[PDB]
Design a protein around this ligand. Structure first.
Ligand SMILES: *[C@@H]1O[C@H](CO)[C@@H](O[C@@H]2O[C@H](CO)[C@@H](O[C@@H]3O[C@H](CO)[C@@H](O)[C@H](O[C@H]4O[C@H](CO)[C@@H](O)[C@H](O)[C@@H]4O)[C@@H]3O)[C@H](O)[C@H]2NC(C)=O)[C@H](O)[C@H]1NC(C)=O
Ligand SMILES: *[C@@H]1O[C@H](CO)[C@@H](O[C@@H]2O[C@H](CO)[C@@H](O[C@@H]3O[C@H](CO)[C@@H](O)[C@H](O[C@H]4O[C@H](CO)[C@@H](O)[C@H](O)[C@@H]4O)[C@@H]3O)[C@H](O)[C@H]2NC(C)=O)[C@H](O)[C@H]1NC(C)=O
Ligand SMILES: *[C@@H]1O[C@H](CO)[C@@H](O[C@@H]2O[C@H](CO)[C@@H](O[C@@H]3O[C@H](CO)[C@@H](O)[C@H](O)[C@@H]3O)[C@H](O)[C@H]2NC(C)=O)[C@H](O)[C@H]1NC(C)=O
Ligand SMILES: *[C@@H]1O[C@H](CO)[C@@H](O[C@@H]2O[C@H](CO)[C@@H](O[C@@H]3O[C@H](CO)[C@@H](O)[C@H](O)[C@@H]3O)[C@H](O)[C@H]2NC(C)=O)[C@H](O)[C@H]1NC(C)=O
Ligand SMILES: *[C@@H]1O[C@H](CO)[C@@H](O[C@@H]2O[C@H](CO)[C@@H](O[C@@H]3O[C@H](CO)[C@@H](O)[C@H](O)[C@@H]3O)[C@H](O)[C@H]2NC(C)=O)[C@H](O)[C@H]1NC(C)=O
Ligand code: WC3
Ligand SMILES: *[C@@H]1O[C@H](CO)[C@@H](O[C@@H]2O[C@H](CO)[C@@H](O)[C@H](O)[C@H]2NC(C)=O)[C@H](O)[C@H]1NC(C)=O
Ligand code: NAG
Ligand code: NAG
Ligand code: NAG
Ligand code: NAG
Ligand code: NAG
Ligand code: NAG
Ligand code: NAG
Ligand code: ZN
Length: 857
């Protein structure tokens, strides 16, 4: 009978104001409260439709706004999409605003989705408690009934009951703090700005504060009393960023408050609820001693993403979930751009390039769907939060900032903000801004529409003849394609020391570029600022390889890695014989930059770990030796210390793990001593942070070391170190222990159920548990489906890791057979069809190139 039989809410009635009353017992885990909301209808509507999940609706009152009288209004719920309907006695007229107030009883969330409750152990055996809210993917339908759609934005005030010890907090700063009857306080806050449903936030817990307000801007990193001291790099960073993100955007923070919390749990999420920026406990903690540079990078990065959202995604709020990549892809770029401008020493470009590399090798699958995709149901909403969209969008924007000038980019942003600020937009509205900001209204951002509306990335083939280098765009294909406007870039040094670095654009299946001179070596997608792979003719490649042998530094550290990832993935599809890829990396004896080495070790090892599971253990042992032999001089020069560039230290972490995990050199010897020394201390000695994981793994093989380690995981609280140990515990070769850890984590007896994906991933990569990991998933799937969603990131990471190294048709038949028998819904999942595709492609890698490497001896 419910009038709106469409998922998207009615475009008629509209909210203007929001006030909220709530009573959180927490101990009961039950809560009752009142809604207060303002509506100014714009089309005549007898019925009003709003969102509402699971409450006790007691009384229903309508306000005509002509008098102080309220009026009973029969209520109807649909819930399938999740809606409620008010049959107002007085029909509605445009500009005839009315008052929305309702009262509900409800149960606090057992899950970590909505208004939820979680109990935590004190330093003492005190079971203290905490509550909060996370409703980003349309969850605030529950708790306060409302217009969950991010279009219907509004101002928000919220008043809730508390206890005196509990320091309650919310989006807006505090105003009224009365003391009611029963010895219970009712803290209140100011009216929020116009904002969407999901950015709201209520939190009630026992937390201290570290503050350092600046320029009329108050910063506070609330946390549980057990820390309130490890939250200093956050403050030092979160202050410095809010200046930078203020200067670029040329808009100040609207609120006066900025509160960065620390939800004391691990099943949390990092959101950007305005004013109170939720975070997981351990997401922000760091010591200038002890913690690794990678640990420092995550805090200096996860801040920046969540921080910049307060502007982009909070002021400007997407109308629908079509452009969640608009928010995520933007701030993720700001992460690795904010870091480059201020924290340049972190060398965060090495982290950006790797993710873009890993991104492309997942986007080049048929399972990939276009970045912009129609959304009409809840599974389509939640499927849109995949990590690939966040990063592909991060690449496209970088490509645009690479093409159009960087200040042109900045001028484009501010107009995009100010014009459509405090409001809903669409993805096109960002593009329109770029055309206006461009000096010519030419270069319409339709160029972007090429990519946003179609899956996959372009493949660019470059064949050069004299002073004419040609181009031929083509789809990356596995042995549609509706064009790609491609911001091509290139560099040439054809005359001796002649330096040419330019830009172009291809809108056609073919194109050619003129060369001012005859050039000898030429590259494309300079520093890989664009989303494409560049093939060369056989001669054109062979030119570039020689330059790596002579002066490999004429290119950039970014550029070299783009070649090395590009050439290896090509040979894996038979588009180039594999031998030339190793012929390329035969320069690696004279490289001093981390990113060229990191990616090569990834592609080298992938063959090693791939060849091993098939059984050519001899060949892979020979393969790793040659890689060692090239970079051997680099390995011997490394110091087992925590000293150097954060970039430079990253190279130490990788290279050593190579030498030790393949038992190459004295890496084994120099490590085991350390583990023996560290174990002697009851864990009370300095282990260098950068080499800690390698050393833990080198010892765990010994039953003494594994026994020593497992007890330390159950004691200490440095979860970063703790997880670093847990890696090493699963790098043993006693298969018996590996079944225990997995089986333990699944029931979460001495571990926790969350960490299970770390093991099934970890056990699979190393040969001993390769066949063991898949069997745990197969034989324990129903608990993996009872203890997780069927489409969870857990499930996808597990299914990929248990299968991504297979490379026999027999294994592929077993995989597809198992899922198919389980359920048809299980078979059409993204996580499986991707993995089946990987096994097929893995088979082709052998078919295209296995025999030639067997002769490579
Ligand atoms: C956690 O948050 C608390 C919140 O208060 C914060 O407390 C701080 O305490 C200092 C104590 O010195 C406050 O210092 C202020 O000094 C100015 C003048 O320099 C005063 O105006 C302030 O209030 C006084 O004056 C008011 C005049 O209208 C009176 O109405 C009032 O009763 C006071 O007499 C106050 O003395 C400081 O303002 C607060 N707040 C902050 C953000 O510093 C505490 O510091 C925070 N935790 C940490 C670790 O910083
Ligand atoms: C330097 O590189 C530039 C690229 O910026 C390139 O200039 C281009 O040369 C081609 C020559 O083929 C031009 O292409 C023509 O464009 C006109 C535009 O109206 C078309 O009508 C033509 O159509 C057909 O012509 C041929 C048959 O007569 C076909 O073989 C051809 O495939 C077409 O189907 C044709 O496309 C292009 O306009 C220019 N663009 C500019 C900006 O100059 C040039 O090749 C390089 N420099 C030199 C000196 O060659
Ligand atoms: C949720 O409802 C429960 C009742 O079901 C409330 O429990 C009450 O909690 C308060 C403190 O939160 C207790 O008061 C304390 O008593 C001790 C011992 O006398 C005293 O030392 C403390 O200073 C404090 O006064 C109270 O005893 C307890 N109720 C009962 C019957 O024992 C709870 O407060 C409610 N929570 C919220 C957020 O409203
Ligand atoms: C500020 O915001 C306004 C809207 O609030 C922007 O207006 C939009 O401006 C573009 C400029 O080209 C218009 O594009 C044109 O749209 C028509 C209809 O689709 C199309 O036929 C044309 O070819 C062209 O694409 C656009 O329609 C217009 N409105 C909307 C709803 O998109 C304005 O550009 C923003 N910026 C500034 C600096 O004002
Ligand atoms: C890794 O090894 C390469 C090997 O070439 C190093 O390149 C060298 O870099 C230094 C520092 O920039 C250059 O020193 C100066 O270069 C400028 C030209 O940019 C020149 O005008 C100066 O007279 C001086 O030579 C050096 O030239 C350059 N090598 C060559 C052969 O030109 C690179 O710096 C090393 N990186 C690290 C981190 O060690
Ligand atoms: C690398 O470091 C980062 C990067 C990103 C984040 C991040 C996390 C986040 O939470 C989304 C979220 O967890 N669910 C909607 C919950 C959910 C999803 C699916 C199924 N069931 C449930 C309960 N949301 C965001 N943001 N922010 C904006 C403006 C838009 C988005 C998507 N970013 C954290 C840390
Ligand atoms: C709170 O959760 C309970 C849990 O099911 C919801 O349902 C009640 O559940 C209990 C325990 O199983 C049953 O004994 C009752 O018969 C259920 N009914 C009622 C009326 O609560 C309950 O619906 C939830 N609270 C609200 C307000 O929906
Ligand atoms: C909820 O409201 C109903 C309305 O009929 C009332 O009878 C009931 O006592 C309330 N409580 C619960 C727990 O549903
Ligand atoms: C309320 O409605 C009137 C007309 O009745 C309209 O002019 C006004 O803009 C609305 N504003 C508020 C704040 O409710
Ligand atoms: C405060 O703002 C002014 C103007 O933007 C600027 O000169 C100054 O550096 C800012 N200082 C801090 C600490 O934010
Ligand atoms: C460890 O950090 C503390 C706190 O900042 C600092 O005072 C101390 O000097 C550091 N330890 C060493 C050995 O430098
Ligand atoms: C590729 O994926 C699309 C959905 O995006 C699907 O319709 C099609 O059947 C798939 N094709 C292959 C060959 O996997
Ligand atoms: C390993 O130990 C032997 C001890 O004789 C030594 O000769 C060798 O130099 C050591 N390792 C390296 C990397 O040099
Ligand atoms: C070693 O450390 C553990 C964990 O703190 C503790 O239980 C044990 O008593 C310690 N033993 C010695 C000899 O220090
Ligand atoms: Zn985000």
């Amino acid at each position: 009978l419910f009038p709106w039989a469409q998922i998207r809410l009615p475009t008629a009635v509209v909210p203007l104001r929001y006030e909220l009353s709530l009573h959180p017992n927490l101990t009961s885990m039950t809560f009752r409260g009142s809604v207060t909301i303002s509506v100014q209808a714009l089309q005549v509507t007898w019925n009003i439709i709003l969102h509402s999940t699971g409450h006790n609706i007691s009384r229903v009152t309508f306000m005509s706004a002509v008098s102080s009288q309220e009026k009973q209004a029969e209520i109807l719920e649909y819930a399938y999409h999740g809606q409620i309907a008010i049959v107002a006695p007085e029909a509605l007229l445009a500009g005839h605003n009315y008052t929305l107030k309702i009262e509900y009883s409800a149960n606090i969330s057992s899950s970590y989705y909505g208004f939820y409750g979680f109990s935590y152990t004190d330093e003492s055996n005190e079971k203290k408690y905490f509550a909060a809210t996370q409703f980003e993917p349309l969850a605030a339908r529950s708790a306060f009934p409302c217009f969950d759609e991010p279009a219907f934005k509004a101002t928000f005030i919220i008043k809730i009951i508390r206890d005196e010890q509990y320091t309650a907090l919310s989006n807006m700063p505090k105003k009224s703090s009365v003391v009611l009857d029963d010895g219970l306080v009712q803290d209140e806050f100011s009216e929020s700005v116009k904002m969407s449903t999901y950015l709201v936030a209520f939190i009630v817990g026992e937390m201290k504060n570290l503050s350092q307000d600046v320029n009329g801007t108050l910063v506070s990193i609330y946390a549980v009393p057990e820390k309130i001291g490890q939250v200093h790099y956050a403050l030092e960073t979160t202050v410095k960023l809010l200046e930078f993100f203020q200067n670029y955007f040329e808009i100040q923070y609207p609120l006066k408050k900025l509160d960065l919390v620390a939800i004391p749990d691990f099943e949390a999420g990092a959101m950007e609820n305005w004013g109170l920026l939720t975070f997981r406990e351990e997401t922000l903690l760091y010591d200038s001693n002890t913690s690794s540079m990678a640990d420092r990078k995550l805090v200096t990065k996860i801040i920046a993403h969540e921080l910049a959202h307060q502007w982009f995604g909070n002021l400007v709020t997407m109308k629908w979930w079509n452009d969640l990549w608009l928010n995520e892809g933007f701030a993720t770029f700001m992460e690795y751009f904010s870091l480059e401008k201020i924290f340049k020493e972190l060398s965060s470009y090495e982290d950006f390039l790797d993710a873009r590399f890993k991104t492309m090798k997942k986007d080049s699958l048929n399972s990939s769907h276009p970045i912009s995709s129609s959304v009409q149901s809840s599974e389509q909403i939640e499927e849109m939060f995949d990590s690939l969209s966040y990063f592909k969008g991060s690449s496209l924007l970088l490509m645009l900032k690479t093409y159009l000038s960087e200040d042109v980019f900045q001028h484009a942003v501010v107009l995009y903000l100010h014009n459509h600020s405090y409001a809903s937009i669409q993805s096109d509205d960002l593009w329109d801004s770029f055309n206006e900001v461009t000096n010519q209204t030419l270069d319409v951002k339709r160029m972007m529409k090429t990519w946003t509306l179609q899956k996959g990335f372009p493949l660019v083939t470059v064949q050069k003849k004299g002073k004419e280098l040609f181009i031929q765009q083509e789809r990356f294909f596995l042995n549609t394609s509706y064009l790609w406007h491609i911001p091509l870039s290139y560099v040439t040094e054809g005359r001796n020391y002649s330096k040419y670095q330019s830009v172009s654009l291809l809108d056609k299946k073919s194109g050619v570029i003129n060369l001012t001179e005859e050039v000898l070596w030429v590259k494309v997608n300079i520093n890989m600022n664009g989303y494409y792979i560049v093939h060369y003719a056989d001669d054109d490649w062979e030119a570039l390889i020689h330059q790596l042998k002579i002066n490999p530094y004429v290119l950039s550290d970014k550029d070299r890695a783009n070649l090395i990832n590009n050439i290896f993935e090509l040979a894996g599809l038979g588009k180039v014989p594999l031998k030339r890829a190793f012929d390329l990396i035969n320069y690696l004896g004279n490289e001093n930059h981390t990113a060229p080495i990191t990616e090569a070790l990834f592609q080298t090892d992938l063959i090693y770990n791939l060849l091993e599971k098939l059984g050519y253990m001899d060949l892979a042992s020979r393969l790793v030796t040659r890689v060692f032999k090239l970079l051997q001089n680099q390995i011997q020069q490394q110091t087992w210390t925590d000293e150097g560039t954060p970039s430079m230290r990253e190279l130490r972490s990788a290279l050593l793990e190579f030498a030790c995990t393949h038992n190459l050199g004295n890496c084994s010897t120099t490590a085991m001593k350390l583990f023996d020394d560290w174990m002697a201390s009851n864990g009370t000695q300095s282990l260098p942070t950068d080499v800690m994981t390698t050393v833990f793994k080198v010892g765990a093989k010994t039953d003494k070391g594994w026994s020593f380690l497992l007890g330390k995981y159950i004691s200490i609280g440095s979860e970063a170190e703790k997880n670093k140990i847990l890696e090493a515990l699963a790098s043993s070769e006693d298969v018996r222990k590996l079944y225990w850890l997995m089986k333990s984590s699944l029931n979460g007896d001495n571990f926790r159920t969350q960490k299970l994906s770390f093991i099934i991933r970890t056990v699979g990569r190393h040969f001993p548990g390769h066949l063991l990991a898949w069997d745990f998933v197969k034989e324990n799937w129903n608990k993996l489906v009872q203890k997780f969603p069927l489409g969870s990131y857990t499930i996808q990471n597990i299914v990929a890791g248990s299968t991504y190294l297979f490379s026999t048709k027999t294994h592929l038949s077993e995989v597809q057979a198992f899922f198919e028998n389980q359920s048809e819904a299980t078979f059409r999942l993204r996580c499986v069809q991707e993995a089946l595709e990987v096994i097929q492609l893995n088979i082709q890698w052998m078919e295209k190139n296995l025999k030639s490497l067997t002769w490579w001896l």
